[PDB]
Amino acid sequence: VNFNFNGLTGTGVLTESNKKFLPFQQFGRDIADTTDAVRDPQTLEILDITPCSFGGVSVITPGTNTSNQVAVLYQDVNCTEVNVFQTRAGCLIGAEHVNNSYECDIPIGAGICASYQTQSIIAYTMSLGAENSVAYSNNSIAIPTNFTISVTTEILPVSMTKTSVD
Amino acid sequence: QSIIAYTMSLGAENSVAYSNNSIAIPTNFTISVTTEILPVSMTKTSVDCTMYICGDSTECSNLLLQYGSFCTQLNRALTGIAVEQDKNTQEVFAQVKQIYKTPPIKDFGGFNFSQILPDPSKPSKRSPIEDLLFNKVNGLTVLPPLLTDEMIAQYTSALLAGTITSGWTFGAGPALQIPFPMQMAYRFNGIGVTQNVLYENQKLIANQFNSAIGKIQDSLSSTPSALGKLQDVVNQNAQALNTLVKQLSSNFGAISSVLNDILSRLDPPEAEVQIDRLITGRLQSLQTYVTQQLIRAAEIRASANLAATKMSECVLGQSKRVDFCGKGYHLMSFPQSAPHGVVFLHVTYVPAQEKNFTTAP
Amino acid sequence: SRLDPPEAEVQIDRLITGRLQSLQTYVTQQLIRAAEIRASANLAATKMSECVLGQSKRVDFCGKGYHLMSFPQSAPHGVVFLHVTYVPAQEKNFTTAPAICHDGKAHFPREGVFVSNGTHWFVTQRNFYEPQIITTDNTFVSGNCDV
Amino acid sequence: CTMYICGDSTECSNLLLQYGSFCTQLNRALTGIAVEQDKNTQEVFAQVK
Amino acid sequence: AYTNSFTRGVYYPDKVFRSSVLHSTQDLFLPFFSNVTWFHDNPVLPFNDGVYFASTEKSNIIRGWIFGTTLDSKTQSLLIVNNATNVVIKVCEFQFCNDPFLGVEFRVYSSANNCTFEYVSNLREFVFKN
Ligand SMILES: *[C@@H]1O[C@H](CO)[C@@H](O)[C@H](O)[C@H]1NC(C)=O
Ligand SMILES: *[C@@H]1O[C@H](CO)[C@@H](O)[C@H](O)[C@H]1NC(C)=O
Ligand SMILES: *[C@@H]1O[C@H](CO)[C@@H](O)[C@H](O)[C@H]1NC(C)=O
Ligand SMILES: *[C@@H]1O[C@H](CO)[C@@H](O)[C@H](O)[C@H]1NC(C)=O
Ligand SMILES: *[C@@H]1O[C@H](CO)[C@@H](O)[C@H](O)[C@H]1NC(C)=O
Ligand SMILES: *[C@@H]1O[C@H](CO)[C@@H](O)[C@H](O)[C@H]1NC(C)=O
Ligand SMILES: *[C@@H]1O[C@H](CO)[C@@H](O)[C@H](O)[C@H]1NC(C)=O
Ligand SMILES: *[C@@H]1O[C@H](CO)[C@@H](O)[C@H](O)[C@H]1NC(C)=O
Numbered sequence: 001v002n003f004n005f006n007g008l009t010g011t012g013v014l015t016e017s018n019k020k021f022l023p024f025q026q027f028g029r030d031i032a033d034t035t036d037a038v039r040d041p042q043t044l045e046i047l048d049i050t051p052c053s054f055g056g057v058s059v060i061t062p063g064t065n066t067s068n069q070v071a072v073l074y075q076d077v078n079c080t081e082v083n084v085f086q087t088r089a090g091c092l093i094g095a096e097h098v099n100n101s102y103e104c105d106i107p108i109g110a111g112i113c114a115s116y117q118t119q120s121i122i123a124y125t126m127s128l129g130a131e132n133s134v135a136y137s138n139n140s141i142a143i144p145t146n147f148t149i150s151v152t153t154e155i156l157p158v159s160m161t162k163t164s165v166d
Numbered sequence: 167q168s169i170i171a172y173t174m175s176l177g178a179e180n181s182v183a184y185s186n187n188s189i190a191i192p193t194n195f196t197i198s199v200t201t202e203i204l205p206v207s208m209t210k211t212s213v214d215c216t217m218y219i220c221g222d223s224t225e226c227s228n229l230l231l232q233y234g235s236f237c238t239q240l241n242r243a244l245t246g247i248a249v250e251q252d253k254n255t256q257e258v259f260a261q262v263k264q265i266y267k268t269p270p271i272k273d274f275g276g277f278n279f280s281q282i283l284p285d286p287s288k289p290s291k292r293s294p295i296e297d298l299l300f301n302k303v304n305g306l307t308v309l310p311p312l313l314t315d316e317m318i319a320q321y322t323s324a325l326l327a328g329t330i331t332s333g334w335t336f337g338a339g340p341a342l343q344i345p346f347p348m349q350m351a352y353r354f355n356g357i358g359v360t361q362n363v364l365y366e367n368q369k370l371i372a373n374q375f376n377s378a379i380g381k382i383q384d385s386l387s388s389t390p391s392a393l394g395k396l397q398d399v400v401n402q403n404a405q406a407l408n409t410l411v412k413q414l415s416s417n418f419g420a421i422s423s424v425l426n427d428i429l430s431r432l433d434p435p436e437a438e439v440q441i442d443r444l445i446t447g448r449l450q451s452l453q454t455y456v457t458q459q460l461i462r463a464a465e466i467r468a469s470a471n472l473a474a475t476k477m478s479e480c481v482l483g484q485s486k487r488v489d490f491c492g493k494g495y496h497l498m499s500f501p502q503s504a505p506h507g508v509v510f511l512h513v514t515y516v517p518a519q520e521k522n523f524t525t526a527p
Numbered sequence: 528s529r530l531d532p533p534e535a536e537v538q539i540d541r542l543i544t545g546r547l548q549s550l551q552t553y554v555t556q557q558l559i560r561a562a563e564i565r566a567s568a569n570l571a572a573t574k575m576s577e578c579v580l581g582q583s584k585r586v587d588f589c590g591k592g593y594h595l596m597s598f599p600q601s602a603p604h605g606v607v608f609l610h611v612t613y614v615p616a617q618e619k620n621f622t623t624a625p626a627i628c629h630d631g632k633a634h635f636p637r638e639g640v641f642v643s644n645g646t647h648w649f650v651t652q653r654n655f656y657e658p659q660i661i662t663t664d665n666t667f668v669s670g671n672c673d674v
Numbered sequence: 675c676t677m678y679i680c681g682d683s684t685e686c687s688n689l690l691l692q693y694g695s696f697c698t699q700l701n702r703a704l705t706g707i708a709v710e711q712d713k714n715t716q717e718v719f720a721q722v723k
Numbered sequence: 724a725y726t727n728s729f730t731r732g733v734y735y736p737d738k739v740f741r742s743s744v745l746h747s748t749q750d751l752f753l754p755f756f757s758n759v760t761w762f763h764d765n766p767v768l769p770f771n772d773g774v775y776f777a778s779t780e781k782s783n784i785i786r787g788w789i790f791g792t793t794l795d796s797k798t799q800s801l802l803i804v805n806n807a808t809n810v811v812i813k814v815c816e817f818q819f820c821n822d823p824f825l826g827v828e829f830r831v832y833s834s835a836n837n838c839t840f841e842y843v844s845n846l847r848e849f850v851f852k853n
């Protein structure tokens with residue numbers, strides 16, 4: 001709502017407060033000079049002021065080269081305010097969340113990753129790799145008998161365009 | 167007691183008894199564990215330029231369109247930083263393709279390892295040392311990291327498990343099991359000390375190792391400044407953000423710091439001028455904040471590159487670079503996670519009691 | 528064209544301030560990008576010196592595995608390194624021990640582990656299985672069997 | 675910052691207060707650099723006890 | 724006589740709730756360990772930027788104040804009398820006595836013209852500022 005409590009104005013969501021004000025204090029202010037609570041001028045109820053939810057809207061999708069289906073993530077927005085999955089990163093709409101873990105494909109934040117699978121976009125908690133217990137003991141040893149040479153490519157930038165602006 | 171002033175000493179003097187015919191060799195040796203703390207990442211702050219400058223006001227939002235891409239470029243720069251923070255985290259911790267685990271039977275010779283290994287008692291599945299490291303530390307949002315503390319911890323558990331059960335073999339390829347005493351024997355051989363020294367004193371070395379690990383835990387608990395580098399990084403970002411909010415409440419020459427008051431009190435022909443002054447001030451402030459962040463980010467990236475190199479050379483192998491992996495002759499190291507960073511426990515060989523024997527070239 | 532000097536001066540001053548601020552931002556962005564490029568160039572120069580003109584012992588500095596050599600290739604605005612590394616492939620469980628007891632003397636491998644075929648002990652290099660007969664010419668003696 | 679911008683002038687010194695912490699942040703940044711220079715010197719030379 | 728104010732004289736700058744925060748504010752305050760005058764009588768004293776008043780009475784002897792400029796009916800003045808169960812705050816063009824006092828009887832002023840305001844509602848410390 002757009003509120004005005006006596007002389008305190010602004011826009012926000014008001015909820016019941018669990019704070020205890022002194023008999024003469026009319027409003028609360030945080031460490032950044034932002035009003036975060038008011039006393040109701042009529043009924044002496046203390047109300048907390050929460051800024052109205054907002055956030056970036058990002059589209060998570062495999063490229064249009066494969067499918068034109070997309071999923072949309074609303075960052076830091078609860079799903080009651082907007083396949084609907086509420087995650088730690090926000091409200092994710094259009095992805096089917098699954099239990100099977102995989103290597104992370106496209107990052108959505110908070111460990112949750114999405115992938116295009118056989119087809120739809122899914123959300124899952126990412127796996128960090130296959131588990132491999134080592135057969136540790138105090139008396140046994142393993143040595144490669146058929147070694148392989150590996151050639152890998154490492155690419156580094158060295159220079160950039162010498163732009164000169166008068 | 168009083169405050170005194172003096173010319174500082176640079177350390178105690180120690181003349182070396184140099185001569186052409188006499189040599190001193192440590193009869194005994196001490197394993198040293200030191201703690202090196204490096205930052206890896208910083209808070210992924212994202213500030214919406216338009217929403218920050220023009221707080222839900224149509225007149226300001228329209229006036230802001232005359233500044234072209236300034237807001238777009240600022241949002242892009244902050245996005246780039248936010249992405250870089252996850253790149254840095256993966257580069258530092260995600261260097262292992264498999265998740266290794268220690269055996270149910272911890273027979274590591276009294277080399278405890280309890281303080282560095284995760285336990286099943288805490289719900290966080292972190293080590294006692296990790297427990298100490300964690301417990302002792304407007305139009306803008308904060309994005310969560312891709313790797314949560316639990317996920318980062320799983321990575322350190324895996325790296326620690328590989329270092330303990332397979333030495334350096336898992337870093338260079340497949341994990342090859344080896345008894346821990348022989349792993350120590352190879353690491354001793356790697357610094358010019360024959361493996362029989364380790365085997366003859368193995369019991370002494372293991373009991374001795376526990377006191378060193380327990381001391382690491384006590385040193386970190388006792389000294390509040392031990393983690394100053396990570397708290398300093400946190401403090402720098404908190405100050406940067408608190409600076410922006412205070413700047414928003416400044417006037418910058420305007421008749422009033424509140425945009426709604428400007429619109430209410432002045433007609434468009436005058437409000438436009440007061441708004442232009444507020445827009446210029448707030449845009450300059452946001453430019454300064456982004457510039458400060460880009461610089462801080464570069465320092466963090468340099469630190470992350472050092473931390474990634476340090477883990478690769480100190481954890482996944484044995485270093486021959488003097489003082490790279492702590493003071494003394496490097497034997498091994500163990501990573502531990504920390505808020506926004508990594509802590510390395512460096513295990514080094516240090517000569518202790520030298521003697522003068524008779525010698526010749 | 529549209530405004531007389533007394534007004535044009537003001538509109539020009541506004542354009543000059545805006546364009547100067549924009550140019551300042553562009554230069555600041557470039558200086559930062561340049562610093563990152565220089566850090567990258569310093570890494571590339573170190574990488575060539577240690578990976579191309581020699582053999583590196585820094586783990587994962589010159590690629591994954593045990594570095595053997597590398598070959599530089601040029602690229603637009605940069606350098607590409609082809610890293611040639613030795614990687615263990617097929618390990619086996621052989622029979623072993625930390626030391627051998629002979630006449631009460633403790634025999635330690637000069638190099639390698641006390642590998643075997645499950646029955647007769649042998650000795651072999653740490654990074655490649657090639658079992659050798661355990662002899663006095665590939666071991667050394669220190670201490671005794673009770674330590 | 676203040677002494678540089680407002681050379682001992684009351685009117686300027688008061689007008690400068692409308693810019694908030696700009697001078698504070700600049701003084702802080704320069705202090706941080708000054709401290710870093712001593713940290714760098716100790717790190718390079720003070721490696722022996 | 725004079726005494727040491729020590730750390731007394733702090734008051735809440737405004738009607739704002741703050742929790743576990745350090746707040747920096749500039750206002751008219753009594754300096755710490757400042758010099759405050761100890762009176763035993765009741766002469767006319769100056770009022771500068773504001774006045775800090777304190778008393779340690781068990782018999783409630785001091786129970787009112789006069790504030791103003793002329794205090795002789797020429798200008799409006801504020802008279803406070805915390806009497807019995809009713810404290811009266813009244814602003815009028817009081818013609819005050821040259822030695823005003825209350826009895827145990829009220830002899831504070833002889834006249835009260837152009838009345839503009841009336842309102843009725845150990846160690847005691849007060850701060851008075853306009
Ligand atoms: C990209 O496009 C090409 C042709 O347009 C297609 O063959 C290829 O599969 C595409 N890749 C993906 C990931 O869709
Ligand atoms: C969404 O709203 C419900 C109802 O108030 C609340 O309980 C829940 O915690 C909210 N989710 C988030 C992420 O705030
Ligand atoms: C994962 O499995 C648990 C039980 O095994 C179930 O309760 C949960 O809903 C599953 N998650 C998904 C996304 O299906
Ligand atoms: C080693 O690998 C090569 C190439 O794959 C193969 O030709 C050869 O048979 C292998 N030798 C052994 C001993 O496994
Ligand atoms: C070496 O130091 C340890 C720990 O102080 C001690 O227990 C041991 O007796 C010492 N041995 C020698 C050779 O002095
Ligand atoms: C590990 O540390 C615990 C802590 O009390 C101690 O009780 C135990 O004996 C130690 N054992 C090993 C194997 O380190
Ligand atoms: C080493 O030699 C110097 C002189 O040659 C002598 O003063 C010193 O005491 C010697 N140290 C020991 C432990 O003998
Ligand atoms: C290595 O030893 C473990 C147990 O000691 C065994 O399970 C595993 O199969 C062995 N590997 C080979 C190749 O024999």
Ligand SMILES: *[C@@H]1O[C@H](CO)[C@@H](O)[C@H](O)[C@H]1NC(C)=O
Pocket residue numbers: 644645646647
């Ligand atoms: C082990 O290797 C040796 C040499 O190749 C061979 O003579 C012996 O038969 C093999 N197995 C046993 C029984 O030790």
Ligand SMILES: *[C@@H]1O[C@H](CO)[C@@H](O)[C@H](O)[C@H]1NC(C)=O
Pocket residue numbers: 804806807808809811829
């Ligand atoms: C105290 O005296 C004043 C004198 O004007 C009078 O107005 C007030 O009512 C008295 N108090 C009580 C309790 O009557």
Ligand SMILES: *[C@@H]1O[C@H](CO)[C@@H](O)[C@H](O)[C@H]1NC(C)=O
Pocket residue numbers: 837839
């Ligand atoms: C009576 O008081 C009012 C205050 O509102 C003042 O303006 C007026 O002049 C006073 N009477 C005389 C005669 O001054």
